Design a protein around this ligand. Sequence first.
Ligand SMILES: Nc1ncnc2c1ncn2[C@@H]1O[C@H](COP(=O)(O)OP(=O)(O)OP(=O)(O)O)[C@@H](O)[C@H]1O
Ligand SMILES: Nc1ncnc2c1ncn2[C@@H]1O[C@H](COP(=O)(O)OP(=O)(O)OP(=O)(O)O)[C@@H](O)[C@H]1O
Ligand SMILES: [Ca+2]
Ligand SMILES: [Ca+2]
Ligand SMILES: [Ca+2]
Lengths: 302, 291
Amino acid sequence: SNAMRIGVIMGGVSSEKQVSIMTGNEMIANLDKNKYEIVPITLNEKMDLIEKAKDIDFALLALHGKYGEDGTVQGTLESLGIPYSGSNMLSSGICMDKNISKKILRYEGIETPDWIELTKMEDLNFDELDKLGFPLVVKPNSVGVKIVYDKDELISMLETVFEWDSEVVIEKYIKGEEITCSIFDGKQLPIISIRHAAEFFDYNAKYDDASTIEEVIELPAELKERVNKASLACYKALKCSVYARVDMMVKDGIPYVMEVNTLPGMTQASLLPKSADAAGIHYSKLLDMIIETSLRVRKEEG
Amino acid sequence: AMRIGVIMGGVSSEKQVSIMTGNEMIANLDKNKYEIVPITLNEKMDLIEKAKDIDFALLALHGKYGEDGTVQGTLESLGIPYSGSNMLSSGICMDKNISKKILRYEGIETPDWIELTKMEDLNFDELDKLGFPLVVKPNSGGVKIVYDKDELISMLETVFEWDSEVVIEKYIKGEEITCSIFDGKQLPIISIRHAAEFFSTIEEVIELPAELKERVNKASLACYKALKCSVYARVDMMVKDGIPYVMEVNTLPGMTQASLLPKSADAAGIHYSKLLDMIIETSLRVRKEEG
Ligand SMILES: Nc1ncnc2c1ncn2[C@@H]1O[C@H](COP(=O)(O)OP(=O)(O)OP(=O)(O)O)[C@@H](O)[C@H]1O
Ligand SMILES: Nc1ncnc2c1ncn2[C@@H]1O[C@H](COP(=O)(O)OP(=O)(O)OP(=O)(O)O)[C@@H](O)[C@H]1O
Ligand SMILES: [Ca+2]
Ligand SMILES: [Ca+2]
Ligand SMILES: [Ca+2]
């Protein structure tokens, strides 16, 4: 039995590169050595992939952020006829574009927060802005998401963001419970709650706003059914394959989709593998399912 | 003197069109402004080696090879400015299902349709909301049309060798036109008529009635924006009862002198060599706006 040669693809620039290295190392360390011949691939520049992938049967992506999201790596691998993990080039690019992904979701009737799309030299229509109210969340579509409380803050923040990016999403702020829903091959995994830590005095909870805890949670049946329905619908709508993670906010019992991730964290401390583990899927087996399901999917694509 | 790669490639019929296109470009590119660097890709990824010799990639590509976005994404990753729409726009416009959803979300008129696959099961229900006749085309790209339930079911099986995904559209019976856009400005509209014997195909610049022209110009420009196209594009439409319908948006329209976009530009007084000058100049600006 000749072992399939798995390239573990690492790369990116700055902190993304480091997260990528850490991810690849975990994969390399947990890949079943009897099933696979493991081939670490570290990309000094993105297009070095063409040379380094000559010796692999499959590309397992350890990438993090733009390099793995924009779709170029997937498209290159496809052009080389080399099967790879996760969503394809178009699904990846769509999911990475928050504006375009929200349009498609909203077209499909999936709840997502109201928003304005704005490009760099484009003016800003204050009548539609006012419809949104304040606070607002400014999302580059290097610089992170930021809550702004009024017109002046918004203006100032647009100017900060636009120097680096040419496009922004301005989203209505929603105060609610944050959750994230991992999907593997069209099946919903355990939901994870993301909230502040509390100190409890009897039944009074005092929250620490500087903290964040992530915990697997079972939601009440009604909301659970609604959440599972929305997340799978995102998955199909955005043409995702193999696995994805949908980030949502719940208010008044209604889930809103903030984003869909085709390249979610894959370290053992990351949300998706934590969800899989709660589902009885240990890390090494999650890696087996990704390779196995990806091969099937790349074959269905031709 | 700026080094311009003329990039040609593809397989089969597409490659031939590509080489034909790149030759025309090489012939008409101003020799005083440019140093022209013919580039022919045997395999797609050979682009990486050959592109170290150039300051700009002018794409002579045709069909999926230049539509899916891999070439654009590769050149972007190499830091090499290139002509036309970027990887995301290209991929979106190549996907008829996705581009239709976005257009419709934006309130742009496009024929009613449904998405279908090899994998999935034909769903009897949704078809008959569409009625007949239907037009059947692969999702990723003459006219294949079906006048009854029987031709449809069969058509799908044959096509399904072609593509894994298919779009089924309501048949729009109308006057066919095509709208070339350059850097956000509409060029003269072209009318496309068909006759077994005229009183194959005729393409001519036609001045549309003022009102229709206005709706057409609005729709074509809205597609251009909605799909994030840049530098140039060609929107193909079907007019019925004064209402324009969008059939599709092309980020890589035919670029020969005999092709529709160059003819449209010609009708505006933009000669072939100058159209290339503008493609290069405009793309350079766009690529810089993107980062
Ligand atoms: N509309 C909103 N209302 C309230 N809080 C929000 C809203 N949008 C985002 N947030 C908070 O900001 C965080 C980050 O936003 P988001 O998930 O949309 O972008 P991202 O995760 O940074 O993008 P990427 O997928 O590139 O990592 C969310 O986890 C949530 O805590
Ligand atoms: N709904 C429709 N009703 C009537 N005629 C149509 C319809 N859709 C397409 N056609 C005809 O079929 C021809 C092909 O159009 P289509 O949109 O399928 O091109 P395409 O193959 O998607 O283009 P590309 O090569 O860029 O992928 C057109 O010339 C048009 O006349
Ligand atoms: Ca997120
Ligand atoms: Ca067409
Ligand atoms: Ca002239």
